[PDB]
Every structure is written in C-alpha cells, then in structure tokens.
Design a binder for this molecule. Structure first.
Ligand SMILES: OC1CCN(Cc2ccsc2)CC1
Ligand SMILES: OC1CCN(Cc2ccsc2)CC1
Length: 460
C-alpha cells in the first residue's frame, strides 16, 4: 500500500444556536447548498480527514460524535476513527479520519484559549487540535470570537490572544506560535465579523441577498477589510465567498433574516453577515487547493447555517535512509549566504538567529549579526557568510526539497524572538545560489523581513 502524497480535508463550522441538530445533516459533509459546492459524482468518496467545529453546541461529546459518525457512515459506508475531540464551554472541535489513516496519525495535541478579562471571560475563545500525518504537521483552530458589529477590534485582539497562547504542535519550536508550527493550519469558526453598513440599510441588504448580489456587501465585510488593512489574519488565505450571509436567520426556514434589535440581542442589530468562516495558512510552495467553500440551505435548527470547506493538501512520507534518522547525511548541506534581517524595532541589542526544522537533529543558533541603520530609519542586521552550515539528517532530494526552515531572530540581551518566518527548500536548482525571502512576524504582526541567498546540496 503506497503512502499518499495528497489527502483531502473537510472543514466544517457551525454555530448551532444552542439547539439540537435536525435528524439529517449529510448536506454539510457533502458540501451541498450555496457557494462553491462539491460535484454529485464525488458524494460517496470519503475525505481523508473531517474536522468539525461547533459553537453554541448544546450536545454532549458522546451525543455529537454519534451523530457525526452515523452521518459519515450513511454517506460513505466507512466507519471513521476519532482522532481527537476537545470542548471549551460550548465551543467544540472533532477530528475524524478514515480507519486506514490510524497508524499514519501521531503526536495528537489539544488545547483551548479563553479570551477576555472578568466581564468578557466566560464564553468566547478557541479550541484546537494538531497532529502529524506521516511527515506532515496539521493544525486546526475553531474560534468563537466576540460578537457585535462595533467590536471588530476586540475580535482582532481575540485572534492575537488565541495564536499567542494556544499550545499545539511541537513544543521544541519554542520561538514559534501556531502560525508557524504546521505545514497546513486551518482556522475556522464563528469569527463574528459583520457587514458594516448602516442599520437603515437592512432591507436593502436583504434585497441584495435575494438577488444573489454579494459584491456591495463583501466590500463592507469586516474580516475582508481588516485583513486588507493587515489588522488580523496576516498571511492567511480565504476562498472567495459566493454564498449568502450565514447569520442571522429565523429558525426552521432560511427565508428570513432576523436583524432587528431585541431585548434578547442586547438591543443590537444583527445585519446579515458572514460570521462563519474558514481560513488557512500553509508553508510556502506546499500544495493546498480549496475545492469547496459554501453553506448548507437545508439545516435550519440554528440562527446560523453550517459552512463547509474542502481542501487538497500535499503530504509527505515518514522518510528513513541508511543514515538519518539518528545521524547526519554528510552528502547534504544548507548554506544561508549574504543574509540580512530588516527589523521595525527601535531597540539596539545584538541579534542572533535560530534555524528550526525536522530535517535537523536539533535547532541551530547562529553567531550575532552586525547591526546597521537603513536609509528610511530601519535596523538592518547583517549576517554576511557567517551563518552555520546546516547539516540535514537525510540528503535525498525527494526528502530535502520538501522541507522548510523556520527562522527566529532573537535578542542577545533577552533571548526573546523579535520575528519569525519560514523558508521553503523547494528550490529551482541545487548547488546554486538562489534568492530567499520571508516576512518576519511576532505575535502574528509584521516586524520585519529576512532575505538573502541559499545554496542547497542534496545527494543528487
Ligand atoms: O493572497 C494573499 C495576498 C493577497 N490578499 C491580500 C488581501 C486582499 C484582501 S484581504 C487580504 C489575500 C492574501
Ligand atoms: O570584517 C569585520 C566585519 C564583518 N565581520 C563579519 C560579519 C558579517 C556579518 S556578521 C559578522 C567580521 C569582521
């Protein structure tokens, strides 16, 4: 049985509105309804991994797992295995995988983050799961962010607290937050960003929705505008939205949006919005293709409609050579040459790098760079040709060209990371000096850039 080089991943997000689901929810897992939908001819083909995020979930873990497994069994005739389930309050993540994947999946981690302080601590936050699938790390975050049209900044703060504090993936990657720990990271949930138009325009918005004319509404979607202004979700992707707003419906139909202020809403309007979203971030030059992104039309127990997204994701095999794991392969080397970091910091400490990668036996710490002033105010940290030659565990090009080097630039004075980034080894050539580049972030915000040249030697 050959190991796969591609899998498909189902991501679902549904704010259940504290109500039990209807007896049939198969449309969700089939990516049928509105938007970018899945071909009927694929209905019996199981996805490799199903990741289900709920919010306002009233069910027990046992009750929901029985509904999910039954649903998938009815669709596919496959009995899925439970990889992980984690619940914080009424926020839940379930990961299911085809039984043939059970021995391919390892290093399963779960965690949660509670957002807010005192008043604002008690029902919003995130749950997450990570694991290895053969040689590929996968992370999944289901977040229920702060509600209300006038709280986009709070949502952005919730996002930063979740990516800082959610402890998933390899703990040895200590300078790196979840936005750098995984080959593929999927972030989804009731992100609660709204269509930011005047209250008076509610009926106009509803009209536009009935005409399937989303352009003048998406131009006011807070998640798209905040992302465009680099306020949130920097370096994440989202498929184009081609489905109607998923919130806020009258229950038991989808014919009516319930937007008017009520005591039950705290006297807030809920103009129709795309609250329910799926975003991703994959390491550079890894295959990831969105094959569906839409909402169901026939599941009406909640004031939200379920959202689905599906992905092709590249994966690699668990490589063994005669040498590594457990020694270096002297036929392999990575040289980072004429490299410099451009930092936005106004500090004047010395800086060093750390190189982290599962292609190394352990992380590598450089000597200090030489600080210079840029012409527009910036700190430039020069490394010249002083960086350590990296000795990968396996030199085979079919392994090494699929790997990535995480880079942290750290203060000599404090050992704290000022910036994190990632470089692909999927080069156009080996034994050749080639340009490399990564932005650097810290707490998911842009803090600088790293650029220079790489020279990769493989056994070919
Ligand atoms: O693909 C990436 C670069 C191009 N964009 C930037 C953008 C446009 C609206 S929101 C964020 C999407 C992410
Ligand atoms: O000749 C002096 C300046 C250059 N260094 C090397 C260097 C370059 C970037 S970081 C360290 C050696 C001494």
């Amino acid at each position: 049985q050959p190991e796969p080089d591609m899998i498909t991943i189902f991501i679902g997000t549904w704010n259940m509105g504290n109500a039990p689901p209807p007896k049939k929810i198969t449309s969700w897992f089939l990516s049928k309804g509105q938007g970018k939908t899945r071909d009927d001819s694929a209905d019996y083909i199981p996805h490799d991994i199903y990741v289900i995020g709920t919010q306002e979930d009233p069910l027990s873990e046992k009750e929901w797992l029985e509904i999910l497994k039954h649903s998938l069994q009815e669709i596919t005739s496959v009995t899925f295995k439970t990889v992980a389930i984690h619940t914080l309050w009424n926020i839940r993540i379930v990961v299911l995988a085809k039984p043939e994947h059970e021995n391919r999946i390892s290093h399963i981690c779960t965690d949660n983050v509670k957002t807010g302080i005192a008043n604002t601590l008690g029902n919003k936050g995130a749950v997450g799961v990570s694991f290895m699938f053969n040689g590929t790390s996968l992370g999944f975050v289901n977040s229920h962010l702060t509600s209300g049209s006038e709280k986009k900044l709070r949502r952005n703060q919730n996002y930063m607290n979740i990516l800082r504090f959610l402890a998933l993936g390899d703990k040895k990657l200590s300078p790196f937050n979840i936005t750098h720990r995984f080959t593929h990271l999927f972030w989804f949930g009731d992100l609660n960003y709204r269509v930011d138009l005047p209250t008076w325009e509610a009926e106009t918005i509803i009209q536009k929705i009935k005409q399937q004319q989303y352009a003048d509404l998406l131009s006011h979607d807070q998640l798209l505008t905040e992302r465009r202004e680099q306020k949130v979700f920097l370096h994440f992707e989202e498929e184009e939205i081609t489905f109607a707003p998923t919130y806020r419906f009258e229950r038991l139909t989808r014919d009516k949006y319930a937007y008017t202020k009520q005591k039950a809403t705290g006297m807030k309007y809920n103009l129709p919005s795309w609250c329910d979203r799926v975003l991703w971030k994959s390491y550079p030059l890894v295959h990831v293709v969105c094959q569906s992104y839409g909402s169901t039309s026939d599941i009406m127990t909640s004031d939200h409609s379920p959202v689905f997204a599906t992905f092709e994701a590249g994966v690699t095999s668990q490589f063994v050579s005669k040498n590594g794991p457990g020694t270096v392969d002297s036929q392999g080397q990575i040289e980072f040459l004429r490299c410099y970091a451009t930092l936005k910091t106004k500090s004047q400490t010395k800086f060093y790098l750390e190189f982290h990668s599962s292609c190394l036996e352990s992380f590598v710490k450089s000597q200090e760079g030489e600080n210079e002033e840029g012409s527009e105010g910036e700190l430039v940290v020069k490394f010249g040709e002083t960086l350590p030659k990296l000795k990968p565990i396996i030199s085979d090009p079919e392994y090494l060209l699929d790997q990535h080097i995480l880079i942290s630039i750290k203060s000599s004075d404090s050992d704290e990371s000022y910036g994190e980034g990632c470089i692909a080894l999927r080069l156009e050539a080996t034994e050749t000096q080639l340009p490399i580049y990564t932005p650097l972030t810290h707490h998911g915000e842009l803090t600088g850039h790293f650029q220079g040249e790489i020279k990769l030697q493989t056994s070919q």
